[PDB]
Amino acid sequence: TKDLYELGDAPPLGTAPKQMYASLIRQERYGRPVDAFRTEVVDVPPVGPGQVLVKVMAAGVNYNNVWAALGEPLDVIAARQKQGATEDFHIGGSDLSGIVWAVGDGVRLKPGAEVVVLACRWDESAQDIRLGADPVTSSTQRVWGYEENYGSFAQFAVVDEYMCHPKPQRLSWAAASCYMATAATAYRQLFGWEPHTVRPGDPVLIWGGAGGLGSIAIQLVRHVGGIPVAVVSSEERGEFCMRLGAKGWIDRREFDHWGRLPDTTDEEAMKQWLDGARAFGRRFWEVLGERRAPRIVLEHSGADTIPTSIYMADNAGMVVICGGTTGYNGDVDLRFLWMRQKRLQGSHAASAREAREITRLIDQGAIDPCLSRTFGFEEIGLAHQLIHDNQHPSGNMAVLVNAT
Amino acid sequence: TKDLYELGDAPPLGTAPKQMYASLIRQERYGRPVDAFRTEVVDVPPVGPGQVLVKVMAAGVNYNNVWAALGEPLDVIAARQKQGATEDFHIGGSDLSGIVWAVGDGVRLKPGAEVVVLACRWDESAQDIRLGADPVTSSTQRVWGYEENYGSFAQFAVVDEYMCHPKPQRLSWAAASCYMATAATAYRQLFGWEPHTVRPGDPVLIWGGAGGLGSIAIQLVRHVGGIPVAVVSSEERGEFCMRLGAKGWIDRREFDHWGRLPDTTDEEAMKQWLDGARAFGRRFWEVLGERRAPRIVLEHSGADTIPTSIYMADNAGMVVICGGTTGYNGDVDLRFLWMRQKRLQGSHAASAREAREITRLIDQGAIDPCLSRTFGFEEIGLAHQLIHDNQHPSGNMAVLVNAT
Amino acid sequence: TKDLYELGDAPPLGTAPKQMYASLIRQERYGRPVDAFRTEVVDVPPVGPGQVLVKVMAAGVNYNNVWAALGEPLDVIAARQKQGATEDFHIGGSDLSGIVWAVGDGVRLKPGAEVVVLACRWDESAQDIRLGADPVTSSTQRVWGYEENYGSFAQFAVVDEYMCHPKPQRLSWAAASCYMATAATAYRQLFGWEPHTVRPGDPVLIWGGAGGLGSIAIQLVRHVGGIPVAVVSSEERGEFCMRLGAKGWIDRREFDHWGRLPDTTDEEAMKQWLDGARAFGRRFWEVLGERRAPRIVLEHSGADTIPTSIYMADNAGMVVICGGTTGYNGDVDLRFLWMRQKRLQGSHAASAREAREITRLIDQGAIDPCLSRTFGFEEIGLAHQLIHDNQHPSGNMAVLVNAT
Amino acid sequence: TKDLYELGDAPPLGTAPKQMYASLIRQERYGRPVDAFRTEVVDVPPVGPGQVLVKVMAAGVNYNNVWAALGEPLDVIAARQKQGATEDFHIGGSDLSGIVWAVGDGVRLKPGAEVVVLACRWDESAQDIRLGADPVTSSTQRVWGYEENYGSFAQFAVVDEYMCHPKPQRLSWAAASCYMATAATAYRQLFGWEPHTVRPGDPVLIWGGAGGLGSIAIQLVRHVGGIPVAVVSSEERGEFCMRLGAKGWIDRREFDHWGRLPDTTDEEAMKQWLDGARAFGRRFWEVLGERRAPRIVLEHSGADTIPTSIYMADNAGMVVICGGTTGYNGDVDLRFLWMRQKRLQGSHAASAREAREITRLIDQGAIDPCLSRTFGFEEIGLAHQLIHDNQHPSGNMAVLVNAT
Numbered sequence A, B, C, D: 001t002k003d004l005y006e007l008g009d010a011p012p013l014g015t016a017p018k019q020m021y022a023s024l025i026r027q028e029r030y031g032r033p034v035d036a037f038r039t040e041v042v043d044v045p046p047v048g049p050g051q052v053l054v055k056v057m058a059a060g061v062n063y064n065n066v067w068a069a070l071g072e073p074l075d076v077i078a079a080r081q082k083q084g085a086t087e088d089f090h091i092g093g094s095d096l097s098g099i100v101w102a103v104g105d106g107v108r109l110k111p112g113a114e115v116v117v118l119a120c121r122w123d124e125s126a127q128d129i130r131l132g133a134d135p136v137t138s139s140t141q142r143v144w145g146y147e148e149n150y151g152s153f154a155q156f157a158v159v160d161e162y163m164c165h166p167k168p169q170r171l172s173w174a175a176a177s178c179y180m181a182t183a184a185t186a187y188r189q190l191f192g193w194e195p196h197t198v199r200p201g202d203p204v205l206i207w208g209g210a211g212g213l214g215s216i217a218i219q220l221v222r223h224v225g226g227i228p229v230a231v232v233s234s235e236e237r238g239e240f241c242m243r244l245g246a247k248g249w250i251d252r253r254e255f256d257h258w259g260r261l262p263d264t265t266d267e268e269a270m271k272q273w274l275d276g277a278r279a280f281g282r283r284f285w286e287v288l289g290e291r292r293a294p295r296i297v298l299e300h301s302g303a304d305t306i307p308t309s310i311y312m313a314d315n316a317g318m319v320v321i322c323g324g325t326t327g328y329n330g331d332v333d334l335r336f337l338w339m340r341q342k343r344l345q346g347s348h349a350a351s352a353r354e355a356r357e358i359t360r361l362i363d364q365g366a367i368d369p370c371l372s373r374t375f376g377f378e379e380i381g382l383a384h385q386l387i388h389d390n391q392h393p394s395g396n397m398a399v400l401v402n403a404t
């Protein structure tokens, strides 16, 4: 019976160790992700009622850990110490696959269970949830591993039972760890906002098709008989999108109207803007082989693309957005929005139901998680540096923890 | 049997006259609405299958006729002559009450029927409608009396049967003519976009509460047990909103952050903006008597207010907008939109179902059309000049045609 | 500091007493409700986390307590002792108004809060709820006060916080206690099953219009601009329905085709049945003043009426049922159901959201709880005997507990 | 230019012939389908506005033509002559693939277009449709080729443009003609009744899995990641269901509680019935590998199975039914229905949107039409005799018309 076990090792099934290895960010090393992370020994948090301790086999890589490593737009360690927190470190990571190792009171999962996690927490007793709100939209919702300490970049992780989903048996630990953040988010975007869900025959414009969200979105649209049109910044990435089932792709480099909308009273500026948007639209028609608009636009690029997305969406269509990679000003030409009765929908993460459904589709082989590269535990910094520099490969990445 | 009948007079019931009085805009008098309209004699258009000729008793006043009179943002007469049209005049008007006077083939309405109109046309055989689209959202939808010639500022008007709704018997001709454009639009905004419809207990932020849309919206929100908070620009208008059932009102003059959003990277500008939005939010809490956000925001003011509306809406809430009085740049802070999963919904006019439902509520006395002033046929110019100058009274206005 | 307080009295606010008065059913007095209940002193159950102790001011009367008193179709005390329960008595009651007197850990309500209860419990951690089920439909749902011991026929009652709703201030304790079981159930029936919810202009057939459910249903249908047609068994009861806003009423005594459906191959029997159903339908047309079918049928009478309800419902309409007063065989002629694409929907109780919404409408005066008679605590037996004998008055009844 | 062309031949593209070959039922040969049909020459009906004349390449086989051939439950020729019809024959057939040969006024399709038909007509100007009804549910809806004369058992057929859908290019004429009636109906059953549509992970009980509806249903359920459990009457048919993607199958011959429900007060009869239903339920659990209920039950067998279907459906689940092969008494135990809040939904045919969507899935290869046998034009009688005698093969059948 030991305080600390090496990675790959653990106390007897059913028992939590006092301490563990984890990858820590500290304020004194805020900056370039490559130098922000270091493996250290820390105390394992307590397992409360309704919680489990997971032996983490692999963990996913995420934009949010880049933010954490930089200390912007927020000093996570300081923001957390105000809440009354004692730790002067941050353990990130918001996707994982692993094995349930110990269980708290009231839990139905048993030690040995293979799980993947949806890295969202909420208060199941919240007033809004009680009166019918989807938990992920609760005032009490927060992102596990980013808005809270003790994420998945750790030998063991305490998770609430409701966060857990059955690991698809066909997947490696890395592949199972890499997908939930992007796949479940894309699934909620495309199928979570009635009555604007992808139907057979629907063209769907997918920004960043070769990226994490986009790679899952293309497969989902194809799977339901929709017509996925991907946007990319290289032929190589376009080819990846074709392999995933895209109808075709549009090279964003061939346009230069990207960015905020001019004042709608600036007639010359609007005419210039419209020229670019219409050129993009004609290219969309070309890829589609017909003069039709996308019924749904899968957004996340944000400021650069939102005006085009709004223009492109069909009458009674939806632009659904879960981020703003290029900036947070989403400039809408209200005329397109109201006259054609379009929906601009914000979306974030997924419900437990959605996490379970996308997991089912992945398990049955309808959808591939698109694992592109696997890192060792000592390479967490390198992995996030790649994302920081926009040099990460297409698809999703993973880090080995206890898995070999 | 005469070619032309004076206002108030008509051929025998069942028979269309060859000619009629109508209020005409001509290009040579484009400009100030007060001088744009003149009564002239014109040929009555043919009544085709599925159409009826209505003896117009009263007609509603509308922003769109101001646009028509100005010749901006479009020369309606020229835009229409390109389509191949022969007329060198425009007869506006997009709300009416009247009596069915003659019927085309296949029509179920009989002469004598008292009707009010939803001034929207669409092709009932349209591809999109056939595949399930709500007709008002069709690629084939257009506004009768504005996007088409021969509106309701005329002794008789040809309308398609599907545009017709039973006139509430309790209303004067003026009151029955004044309401459809605003009341049905507000009804679609508040009850037409599942799952974001007003429920008992929901706070609803209503811009322009004393205006046409707002006056109906406050009553509708109150009627279903929601909590209407009105925005106004005077105490007198606030008092009107209270009489309509508002919980309270906010004076927009007390804030100065109105307008487009700064670049989200401009930290000083954003902090200034947020200070104003939060001040507005605290005032909202005060009127409500509790720290809660509006679940639905009824928009139409547009550029000045949209950033505040987006900020204000509750998690999983909706900002629904049908115009842009102050401008067409709707600037969204994507962070508020996606992180709290908010919906920004464009809406326009109403479906026939919605027109019929709001008519039912008005008929049964649940909702008052808010007729504020009635004009004579020779005062159509004056009436629209008032709107042009923003000197029109609260509520909705009407013009007498054949009614005395 | 005393073990036991007389009705109307209590320990200091914030403190639970060791014992209390309650109205008990015991197996040795199973039978006629009038002799089944007796006031006794019992131990007050513990208040756990998330629970509160309510000082019960008044309690509602309910069919279910008749079942309990009879010992059919279930010996509640025996069924409960198998679960491992120790008590040899049953304290019924499934509606109450009262004052929060003591609170468990984690509760947001404070002592002094005036509440009414939705008498449904469920496990907020249930698997089905976690994956998106409405809690009232959970595998874990059960009726508080009937399927569990220690209901509201008691000086104090332990309730879970999620069961609580704010007592409308305008109502007496009796009126506030009498409504939730029927009003929230009717509200879920009529507004809870999208897309089949009552819209302005919809005719709605309401069985038992003068009864508990029906009295609320008529008001709700009228309130939203629907057209309520009530079924009754006397002119006096018809007149009550008119006062509540019914368009008119149908006397069920004038028909004799009630009951199970004949074999659909029995042509003479079907022709006889259809003759009665069509006669009922023509009477419906008469009350309505037009040849239209009800879009929604509010059911609960069950076996006698279901075949007629199914026949009557409009194309794409709904028959929604929450009980089977006359029997549990609901015989459907599948031809009417499939050819006209009708919905037969089972419904039970309400969600917390629905309980809160109907409470809001009652609070604002849109809906009256229809309190018909108030009893003293020693008359609980008499009150339920009335229901047993079908001699109870129209509307809803209540029993005073601590209220005077 | 000839009056009459042999099968396989036609006038020049764009031109309708005066006469055509067709397969006729006449009253004097009502009875066994094998002797009810005879090829004769008839006049081709006129092509009106919005209509097209299709050169029929192949036609589907259908239960409804058996009814027609028998003259029960209706003498179609007599029922139609009362409407004022002149013909003393009936040309059946309600599925077809073919080539548009001539077009009426206003039509967008061009001669040469390859189409399959949804054999439903409605009035696009109907009051109910105008106020929002799905056309297939209209008071004006009827089945083309059965409720109307001049179906697809004819060299040419007049169809309304809205009935037409693009023929999947990969399919033979026979395969394209065989699927719409069953595939679109099953698609509406499973995906047409929000919020009860098949989701990934949902078990679905499918009666008649090897049949027309069932064969499509199994594929659809599998495709969306649901778990299809088929009911069959032979091992051979079970094996077919496995090939289509079923999780497993249940042999209905192993149970004998099938049929109408006993009176719910008959305790011995109910206990016997429940024993059979529970045995069926345990077998369902076995096939599934877990103790779960089907969320959706795909019904059509009717009287024999409905009580079991209602018992089997999960809490808040749906039994959706489009026929009653075994009889029209659908006996519901209201206790299961209301206490567990289950939906019993009638469904018929499909909307145009649904026909187009299932066609898209078939075109893309997600779904196979399951063509089991193709007949010559002179074998229409034989084909329907097979169905009459329940000796037809699994899947769907077709008849060649102009195709070779």
Ligand SMILES: NC(=O)c1ccc[n+]([C@@H]2O[C@H](COP(=O)([O-])OP(=O)(O)OC[C@H]3O[C@@H](n4cnc5c(N)ncnc54)[C@H](OP(=O)(O)O)[C@@H]3O)[C@@H](O)[C@H]2O)c1
Pocket: A063, A064, A181, A182, A185, A207, A208, A209, A210, A211, A212, A213, A214, A231, A232, A233, A234, A237, A252, A300, A301, A304, A305, A322, A323, A324, A325, A326, A347, A348, A349, A350, A395
């Ligand atoms: N729960 C959530 O809210 C949630 C979940 C997942 C992701 N997100 C957010 O969504 C965004 C995308 O995530 P991801 O995992 O898909 O990242 P990713 O793998 O980096 O993919 C994003 C892709 O967007 C494209 N892109 C970059 N700049 C662009 C521009 N100016 N215009 C158009 N496209 C551009 C790039 O592809 P090309 O260069 O080929 O165009 C890029 O690879 C991130 O901001 C992320 O934080 C949010």
Ligand SMILES: NC(=O)c1ccc[n+]([C@@H]2O[C@H](COP(=O)([O-])OP(=O)(O)OC[C@H]3O[C@@H](n4cnc5c(N)ncnc54)[C@H](OP(=O)(O)O)[C@@H]3O)[C@@H](O)[C@H]2O)c1
Pocket: B063, B064, B181, B182, B185, B207, B208, B209, B210, B211, B212, B213, B214, B231, B232, B233, B234, B237, B252, B300, B301, B304, B305, B322, B323, B324, B325, B326, B347, B348, B349, B350, B395
């Ligand atoms: N089918 C459709 O799409 C449809 C239908 C109806 C209306 N609309 C559009 O909706 C808009 C409003 O229509 P309405 O009939 O209600 O007109 P209205 O009667 O003039 O009411 C609009 C009100 O908005 C308020 N307002 C004006 N400037 C504002 C600002 N800068 N910030 C905030 N509030 C301001 C004013 O009230 P206070 O000064 O008291 O704030 C004004 O009376 C118009 O642009 C109209 O064209 C569209």
Ligand SMILES: NC(=O)c1ccc[n+]([C@@H]2O[C@H](COP(=O)([O-])OP(=O)(O)OC[C@H]3O[C@@H](n4cnc5c(N)ncnc54)[C@H](OP(=O)(O)O)[C@@H]3O)[C@@H](O)[C@H]2O)c1
Pocket: C063, C064, C181, C182, C185, C207, C208, C209, C210, C211, C212, C213, C214, C231, C232, C233, C234, C237, C252, C300, C301, C304, C305, C322, C323, C324, C325, C326, C347, C348, C349, C350, C395
């Ligand atoms: N959560 C739930 O599931 C829930 C909630 C509330 C009620 N329920 C159930 O719903 C049923 C009605 O409840 P309630 O509170 O409204 O009771 P109620 O006050 O007794 O009203 C029921 C009315 O139904 C009518 N009725 C009786 N026999 C009939 C017959 N053979 N045909 C047609 N109508 C008949 C009677 O009115 P006329 O004689 O005037 O026709 C009677 O007053 C009960 O079985 C109850 O248990 C269930």
Ligand SMILES: NC(=O)c1ccc[n+]([C@@H]2O[C@H](COP(=O)([O-])OP(=O)(O)OC[C@H]3O[C@@H](n4cnc5c(N)ncnc54)[C@H](OP(=O)(O)O)[C@@H]3O)[C@@H](O)[C@H]2O)c1
Pocket: D063, D064, D181, D182, D185, D207, D208, D209, D210, D211, D212, D213, D214, D231, D232, D233, D234, D237, D252, D300, D301, D304, D305, D322, D323, D324, D325, D326, D347, D348, D349, D350, D395
């Ligand atoms: N638009 C519409 O409303 C529509 C559309 C299509 C079909 N339908 C109707 O739906 C029904 C089925 O159509 P289909 O095309 O699938 O016919 P089908 O190919 O004959 O399949 C029906 C299957 O049901 C099963 N069955 C027969 N008797 C049964 C019993 N007593 N209990 C349980 N299962 C039984 C049989 O399979 P096993 O012997 O292997 O169990 C049979 O092959 C027909 O009545 C048809 O008229 C309606």
